[PDB]
Amino acid sequence: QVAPKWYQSEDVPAPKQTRKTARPQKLRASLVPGTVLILLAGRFRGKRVVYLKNLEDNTLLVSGPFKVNGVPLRRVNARYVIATSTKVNVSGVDVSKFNVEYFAREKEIKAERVADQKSVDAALLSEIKKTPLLKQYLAASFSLKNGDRPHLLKF
Amino acid sequence: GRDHTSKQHVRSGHRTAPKSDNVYLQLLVKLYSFLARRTDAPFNKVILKSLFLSKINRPPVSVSRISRALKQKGAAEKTIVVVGTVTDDNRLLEFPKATIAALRFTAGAKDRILKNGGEAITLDQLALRAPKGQNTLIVRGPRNSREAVRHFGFGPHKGKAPRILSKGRKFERARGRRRSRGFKV
Amino acid sequence: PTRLTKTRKHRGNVSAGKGRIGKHRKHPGGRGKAGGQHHHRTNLDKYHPGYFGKVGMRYFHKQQNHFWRPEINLDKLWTLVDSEKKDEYLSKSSASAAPVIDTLAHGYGKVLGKGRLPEVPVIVKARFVSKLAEEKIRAVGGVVELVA
RNA sequence: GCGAGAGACCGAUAGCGAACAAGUACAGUGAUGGAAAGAUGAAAAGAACUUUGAAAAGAGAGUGAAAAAGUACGUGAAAUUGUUGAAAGGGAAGGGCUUGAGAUCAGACUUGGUAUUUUGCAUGCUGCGGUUUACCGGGCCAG
RNA sequence: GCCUAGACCGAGGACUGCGGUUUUUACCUAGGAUGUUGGCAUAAUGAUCUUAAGUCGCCCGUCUUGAAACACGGACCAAGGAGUCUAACGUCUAUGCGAGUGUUUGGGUGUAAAACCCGUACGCGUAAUGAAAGUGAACGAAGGUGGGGGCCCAUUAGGGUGCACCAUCGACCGAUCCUGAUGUGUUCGGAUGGAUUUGAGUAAGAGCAUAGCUGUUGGGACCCGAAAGAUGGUGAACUAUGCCUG
RNA sequence: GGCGAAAGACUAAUCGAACCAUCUAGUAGCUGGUUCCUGCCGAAGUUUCCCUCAGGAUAGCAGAAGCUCGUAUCAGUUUUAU
RNA sequence: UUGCUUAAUUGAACGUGGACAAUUGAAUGAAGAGCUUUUAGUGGGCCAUUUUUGGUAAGCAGAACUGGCGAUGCGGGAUGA
RNA sequence: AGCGUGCUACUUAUACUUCACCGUGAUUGCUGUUUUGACGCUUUCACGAGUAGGCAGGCGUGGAGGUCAGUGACGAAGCCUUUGCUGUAAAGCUGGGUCGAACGGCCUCUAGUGCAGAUCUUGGUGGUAGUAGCAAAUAUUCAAAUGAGAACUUUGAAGACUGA
């Protein structure tokens, strides 16, 4: 067999200096807070939800609202979401306290999270009541019927 | 596809190393590989090439050639460099005093040089007293005086020697070598 | 060594380097020097001119000892002088006392005159000398003594 | 021919034709021609005895380190064949490339580090496997 | 000039560079991928084998302009099976010594076919040329001219010296042809001077020895293959013919 | 050589010259075969001579070893002039 | 310089010395130029365009130039040197 | 979906462009940091068809000199095998099974050294294939015995034939 030689060093060289400085994410124009979204993947696929805040994790903060849909406050990915043209005035909804660590991983649900869900749902519902059939629209699931062509549909 | 104007993957056709496996010859190549690479003197690159040459391309240089080279105008005190064997010549009537650097000296050649107050150094000692080959004079032996060259390019009206085993009146002298026996070529 | 021959490299290739068309055969062209005047004439004429025919007279029972006469030139004549006394001889030699060089006892027949001598008298003993060799020897003050 | 000593020789289709009852068996009127054929085991200890069978044999048993050594004898290849298992199969089969399915194999929770508890050693607690959630960091596959 | 949609790839591995912003001995998109998140580690992933499907795929070797051929060999398997050795050589390479070189026919010695030691001859080389008798290589710094690596002096250039080698003109030796001095066993000698002649020559030696690949010749000569020829013997138990006896 | 009322018949399944052994591994310009891998380069069927025409030698084409040098002066090309 | 040549101091050939430098005297290109040794296989060829001879013609016979096949796969011509 | 003609888009070669990796050739640099590899390391660019043929580097087999104070009866060599791994390959190494006595690596040396073919040699084994076939010579049958077993042996009875 071919024996190893003294000159076959095992030292691991350091990597070169990388010039990949990350630059902030660009969202689509259709993703404006208060816009109603359709979730395309996950457990809640087909659910219509309300977009509240753009988190720093490059994700979107979204509510059902829970009392309407059963979808709680959670993050979603922009690329797994169809942004419709319907909008809800969310100027009266305080989404300031929600950040990345709010969703940090620590069934039994946190009391603070449930209270925040209720507090957000209050203002969200009070605004939703203004537009007729919006509450009925949210609670219904989206699906593709026979003959719907998404390349022709307006959302 | 490419239209090749020349032949592809052609080696240079020059020796890049000695065919020999002499360990001491390889130390001279090591020493003169460094000098040729690191000095930028033309003498160093010439010596490095000569160390690669085969035996017939390093003919012996007689002690008479060195005598004739030392007799050039202003060359009486130059360091004679011979990449090969320096041999004796009994035909010389006198030999001057000079420093000769050579791969090998015969017993006779070394004797005469020292007997006349000269110095016989090797090529490694040369790199000490002349790392750039200052004040040197490279001498080469006669290549076409070899016996095998007598028969090269033999043909009609060429004047080269036939490849023959025996020499005499009965050995390729009649027809084609004599106009009384047909023709002469 | 058989292992460095090309026979070991030709293994696996059909013709062993002899070609498929030519088909290495027993003796195409004949044996030895066959056809030297018929179908090998183009080779003998080109490379061995003078091969065919007779030149000169025969010599029945040629004894090569008669023609023994090795040559020595004048540029090599001082090598026959004893090595240890060469330098002493080259300095003190005169017409009253010059070194004697017996070329015959060293195995030479004729002294030829190529080269130049040291400007030193010598007494050369030879069976034969050339005209120019003896002129050069007397020119340095020497002489040639013919022996048998 | 007689008697010795050797080898970078051959190793049972080789080396003499002949490692063996080989110039033998055998062929040809004859002159002549001319093979094949080595190896159980350390030792026959070569299978006593019972049973089925007309017997050969078989099944038990026994000897043996081994019967996957039984004289049809060391090992026991391939062609070819049997049984079992798997699989495919409309006038061949076989191959390459690509993926699927089934089978097989491989691999980082690394010789992972951090405090931890008990199990275990000759020993006067010390090298160190053991355990589970913590913390840090890693591997691989993806967004 | 600006906006915008998608696909493939991420080689390299401290720094060094060119630029840009300079708010700066700082930072950057500027000499090649990083950041973050999830899952898995009884598996996601990869490979191989068998098989299905899609697509392509004629049976190899051979001679041949041309083979899948309705050209030839090949049922299958194992084992054996074909450029070898030698004498003498050419080129090239390696090694030793080098105007020399080669111990090994032989002797001495021995730890006995070894190893070690010795030397005369001899071979090849160092001189050629002529059929031969024979003769036998410096006018010169071993010549001149044009190049010529390298070295020296310069300071781009340039100058000097210029080995090998190339082209060329000469000189020297031998042969052939011519000329024909002093002389003489009066027919010998051959100085000197020449010639669109010639040599495998000189012109500061390069060889010898061993080994190796390759090529050559002779050998069985890469392996197998005739129809033939010769030498010495064996057969008329078949058959042909004659005879003897049935 | 024999023998032949003759067919080139027969002479031990052998006859337009038996069989046996040897010379002998006879010679073959002709047929068949010629055994591992990868890398790099890579042809010719043309010239002249040969009782040469299924073969050789020769030149050409190819490889290998290189050697002297380092852009010198070279080219399956154009232009100009002739 | 010469022994050649001219009536000759004329020439012819080879030179000494002096001047003319990067447009040193067209373009384009140059995996560089030159030189040598040694040896293999080959010496049955065939096809296409164009020119062309014999022949009624031929997948016929014989030439010229080039390119191919042989020695070569791959995409197209269904198939095909 | 023919013929003549025009246009637009589209399809896809081992071709071209960019990138990766392999090799070859050239090329940059490397000893006062050459440092236990300079026959090495390293930078860059271009290139890669191939019979006959040439050359180079390697793989494998029998034996030889040296070395591994190498492996091995606690199992060498051999053989079988979706146990795999390594190499472009020649091949090498390994898991399991079988087996029973020697064998390998590395540096060199050496050769009777590598097979698919030669109507190859010797040996063995198939398909064909339970197939062709076992059909001339008139002709057999019953019983008993023997025997494990009787178309086929023996004996008896019969029927036949050879027909001097």
From Swiss-Prot, chain A:
The keyword Ribonucleoprotein applies. Keywords: Cytoplasm, Ribonucleoprotein, Ribosomal protein. It is found in: Cytoplasm. GO terms for molecular function: RNA binding; structural constituent of ribosome. GO terms for biological process: cellular response to starvation; cytoplasmic translation; filamentous growth; filamentous growth of a population of unicellular organisms in response to biotic stimulus; filamentous growth of a population of unicellular organisms in response to starvation; translation. InterPro entries: 60S_ribosomal_eL6, Rib_uL2_dom2, Ribosomal_eL6_CS, Ribosomal_eL6_KOW, Translation_prot_SH3-like_sf. The keyword Nuclease does not apply. One of its GO terms (cellular component) is cell surface. Its main location: cytoplasm. Residues 1-25 are annotated as: Disordered. It comes from the Eukaryota. Component of the large ribosomal subunit. Mature ribosomes consist of a small (40S) and a large (60S) subunit. The 40S subunit contains about 32 different proteins and 1 molecule of RNA (18S). The 60S subunit contains 45 different proteins and 3 molecules of RNA (25S, 5.8S and 5S). Component of the ribosome, a large ribonucleoprotein complex responsible for the synthesis of proteins in the cell. The small ribosomal subunit (SSU) binds messenger RNAs (mRNAs) and translates the encoded message by selecting cognate aminoacyl-transfer RNA (tRNA) molecules. The large subunit (LSU) contains the ribosomal catalytic site termed the peptidyl transferase center (PTC), which catalyzes the formation of peptide bonds, thereby polymerizing the amino acids delivered by tRNAs into a polypeptide chain. Belongs to the eukaryotic ribosomal protein eL6 family. This is Large ribosomal subunit protein eL6. It comes from Candida albicans (strain SC5314 / ATCC MYA-2876) (Yeast). The lineage of its organism: Eukaryota, Fungi, Dikarya, Ascomycota, Saccharomycotina.
Swiss-Prot record, chain B:
InterPro entries: Ribosomal_eL18, Ribosomal_eL18/eL18-A/B/_CS, Ribosomal_uL15/eL18, Ribosomal_uL15/eL18_sf. Coiled coil: none annotated. Its main location: cytoplasm. It is found in: Cytoplasm. Belongs to the eukaryotic ribosomal protein eL18 family. The lineage of its organism: Eukaryota, Fungi, Dikarya, Ascomycota, Saccharomycotina. GO terms for cellular component: cytosolic large ribosomal subunit. One of its GO terms (molecular function) is RNA binding. This is Large ribosomal subunit protein eL18. GO terms for biological process: translation. The keyword Phosphoprotein does not apply.
From Swiss-Prot, chain C:
InterPro entries: Ribosomal_uL15, Ribosomal_uL15/eL18, Ribosomal_uL15/eL18_sf, Ribosomal_uL15_CS. GO terms for molecular function: RNA binding; structural constituent of ribosome. Residues 1-43 are annotated as: Disordered. Its main location: cytoplasm. It is found in: Cytoplasm. Residues 1-12, 20-41 have a biased composition (Basic residues). One of its GO terms (biological process) is translation. It comes from the Eukaryota. Signal peptide: none annotated. GO terms for cellular component: cytosolic large ribosomal subunit; nucleus. Keywords: Cytoplasm, Ribonucleoprotein, Ribosomal protein. Belongs to the universal ribosomal protein uL15 family. Component of the ribosome, a large ribonucleoprotein complex responsible for the synthesis of proteins in the cell. The small ribosomal subunit (SSU) binds messenger RNAs (mRNAs) and translates the encoded message by selecting cognate aminoacyl-transfer RNA (tRNA) molecules. The large subunit (LSU) contains the ribosomal catalytic site termed the peptidyl transferase center (PTC), which catalyzes the formation of peptide bonds, thereby polymerizing the amino acids delivered by tRNAs into a polypeptide chain. Component of the large ribosomal subunit. Mature ribosomes consist of a small (40S) and a large (60S) subunit. The 40S subunit contains about 32 different proteins and 1 molecule of RNA (18S). The 60S subunit contains 45 different proteins and 3 molecules of RNA (25S, 5.8S and 5S). This is Large ribosomal subunit protein uL15. It comes from Candida albicans (strain SC5314 / ATCC MYA-2876) (Yeast). The lineage of its organism: Eukaryota, Fungi, Dikarya, Ascomycota, Saccharomycotina.
